[PDB]
Structure 1
Amino acid sequence: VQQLSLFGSIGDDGYDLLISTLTTISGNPPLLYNSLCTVWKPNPSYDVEPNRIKLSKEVPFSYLIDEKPLNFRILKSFESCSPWSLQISDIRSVSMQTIAETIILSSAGKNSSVSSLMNGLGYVFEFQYLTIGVKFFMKHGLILELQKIWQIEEAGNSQITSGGFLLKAYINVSRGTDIDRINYTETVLMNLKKELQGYIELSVPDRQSMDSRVAHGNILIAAALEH
């Protein structure tokens, strides 16, 4: 698929406001969701001349919340393998990215852990992060994700977005869609950008940010680290 997107952030203080505003613009409620992602790269020891592989899934919320009721406000208080989405992405007033995806449903055998399966393909673990947020469905396939992100590291977790939330606005279109449709799609994003001016600055991450080691070729992480 082809993904067009924009990113921006706000401090914790404007969260309720942005939430209310997005509810008004879309006419819909904020839907809570989370995703755990692991990034993998070709084993450097094998020297192959970089298509990173990203594995992603949802985790039940009870694994991230402790212990009354669950909603958008919760964000303020901050052996077969399982199924995983497997993605490989590659690269203009908006961000444009091509995404190749397949779904992993299960595994079996001696080395069935998702980690062994990746080593089997010649890849090694590189980075891991967790996102928790709310999303809004808007017109024309437009999707908004207001989230906080955590890098899960061997020596402890760290909220990359501490102090605020990262906002991602995107639209997925068919690969090979007309130049006119791509243009139209970009148009919807610019319209959301204007409509949200004063509330939040929507833009595409630079290249210095896009290339920093800390981002691991990941646009979302790059955007979160930018501001």
Structure 2
Amino acid sequence: MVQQLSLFGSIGDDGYDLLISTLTTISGNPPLLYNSLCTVWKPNPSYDVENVNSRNQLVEPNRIKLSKEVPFSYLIDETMMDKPLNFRILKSFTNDKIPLNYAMTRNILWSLQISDIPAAGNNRSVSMQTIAETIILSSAGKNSSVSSLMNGLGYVFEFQYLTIGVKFFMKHGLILELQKIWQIEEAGNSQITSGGFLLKAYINVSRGTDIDRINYTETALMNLKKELQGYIELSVPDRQSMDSRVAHGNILI
């Protein structure tokens, strides 16, 4: 469980290369390639959860995220082994098509994660969100599989998507991510972040009670934002967009 303090933004791919150089001028570090695959699961509507205390609202149903890393050998087509595995490959990832299709992901079926809507009030300068996390290491039995496990808990699959981007590690534990997101269905693959990169700068705090640390984290994030003034505008997203409860449906992408 962490308090994640975050700021968001977006950029057009035209400046992409330039942006990268500037980051290396500041951090002093080179970018590192990465990828991931997230699957979202929701409580089964076939089961009537009368246990939701309607007269008191002790709790509301929520959605579970399962993440995993996928090797690049599934994301590189027959035209791309010649180039080395570095960040420049992202320049060729502008098409809505991608080597990883629905059948391979179905064949695949980790990190389990749950979150809450950010803190209310208009006196917050950065998006503060609470995250509860655990890890699944292995399994066994006659039906050892992620799908069977989540159906045993009482959850069913809803959708999935694939993230590819680069990471920058700066001082004080600040992490800056440049991402491209591909939604995947049997109908096909569609790039929601079409013609651009999604930028997200964030820090993690282990204990929410410590307030000196939280103040330091906010100071670092606002200093970073004030450093990038004039190039990219980093902003607090909409509090109602980062809500992932089942009752109301929307997805920040």
TM-score with structure 2 length normalisation? 0.79
1:82-106 C-alpha deviation (Å, 9 max, x unpaired)? xx01111113111111111111111
1:174-205 C-alpha deviation (Å, 9 max, x unpaired)? 12342222121111111111111222111122
Which structure shows the higher helix fraction? 1
8 A contact 2:181–2:193 mirrored in 1:
yes
**Whole-angstrom distance in 2 between the partners of 1:90 and 1:106:** 27
Cα deviation, residue 56, structure 1: 0.4
Cα deviation, residue 214, structure 1: 12
State which of 183, 208, 217 in structure 2 corresponds to 1:151: 183
Cα deviation, residue 215, structure 1: 13
**Whole-angstrom distance in 1 between the partners of 2:247 and 2:165:** 20
> Could you say if the C-alpha distance between residues 155 and 74 of structure 1 is closer, same or farther in structure 2, counting changes exceeding 3 Å?
same
1:54-88 C-alpha deviation (Å, 9 max, x unpaired)? 1001100111121331111111101xxxxx01111
> Could you say if the C-alpha distance between residues 198 and 217 of structure 1 is closer, same or farther in structure 2, counting changes exceeding 3 Å?
farther
1:168 matched residue in structure 2 = 200
SS of equivalent residue, structure 1 residue 199:
coil
SS of equivalent residue, structure 1 residue 6:
strand
Q: Which has the higher contact order (CA 8 A, sep 6+)?
A: 2
8 A contact 1:4–1:94 mirrored in 2:
yes
Q: Flag the structure with larger Rg.
A: 2
Q: Which moved more, 1:48-57 or 1:101-110?
A: 48-57
8 A contact 1:210–1:217 mirrored in 2:
no
**Whole-angstrom distance in 1 between the partners of 2:251 and 2:129:** 9
1:21-49 C-alpha deviation (Å, 9 max, x unpaired)? 11111100000000100011111221395
> Could you say if the C-alpha distance between residues 20 and 177 of structure 1 is closer, same or farther in structure 2, counting changes exceeding 3 Å?
farther
> Could you say if the C-alpha distance between residues 157 and 7 of structure 1 is closer, same or farther in structure 2, counting changes exceeding 3 Å?
same
Cα deviation, residue 154, structure 1: 2.6
Q: Which consecutive segments of 4 or more residues in structure 1 shift more than 3 A? A: 207-220
> Could you say if the C-alpha distance between residues 49 and 195 of structure 1 is closer, same or farther in structure 2, counting changes exceeding 3 Å?
closer
> Could you say if the C-alpha distance between residues 204 and 159 of structure 1 is closer, same or farther in structure 2, counting changes exceeding 3 Å?
same
**Whole-angstrom distance in 1 between the partners of 2:16 and 2:246:** 26
Q: Percent identity between the aligned chains?
A: 100
Aligned-residue RMSD, C-alpha = 2.4
8 A contact 2:61–2:247 mirrored in 1:
no
Q: Which moved more, 1:100-109 or 1:47-56?
A: 47-56
Which structure shows the higher strand fraction? 1
**Whole-angstrom distance in 2 between the partners of 1:104 and 1:194:** 39
**Whole-angstrom distance in 1 between the partners of 2:17 and 2:167:** 14
Cα deviation, residue 218, structure 1: 8.1
8 A contact 2:42–2:246 mirrored in 1:
no
**Whole-angstrom distance in 2 between the partners of 1:214 and 1:159:** 24
8 A contact 1:137–1:144 mirrored in 2:
yes
Q: Count residues with an aligned counterpart.
A: 216
> Could you say if the C-alpha distance between residues 174 and 212 of structure 1 is closer, same or farther in structure 2, counting changes exceeding 3 Å?
closer
